[PDB]
Design a protein around this ligand. Sequence first.
Ligand SMILES: [Zn+2]
Ligand SMILES: [Zn+2]
Length: 78
Amino acid sequence: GSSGSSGEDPFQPEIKVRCVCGNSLETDSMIQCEDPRCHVWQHVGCVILPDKPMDGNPPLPESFYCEICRLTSGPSSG
Ligand SMILES: [Zn+2]
Ligand SMILES: [Zn+2]
């Protein structure tokens, strides 16, 4: 038989990284979902598009919604 050690330290950032790319890693650049419950992390150079014409300011959108939120728009009240 084998064993398995599990138990991280409470002194670490509980990041989610619900990015689309599929990668569950973190870097020195990410956008948090406006939603309180969601508060998911999503790489900047993944969902956010490049600013060819703008090439700068304004900076990242203060009001951004992940793929889980951006998709949830319709009421679907049945
Ligand atoms: Zn990503
Ligand atoms: Zn969200």
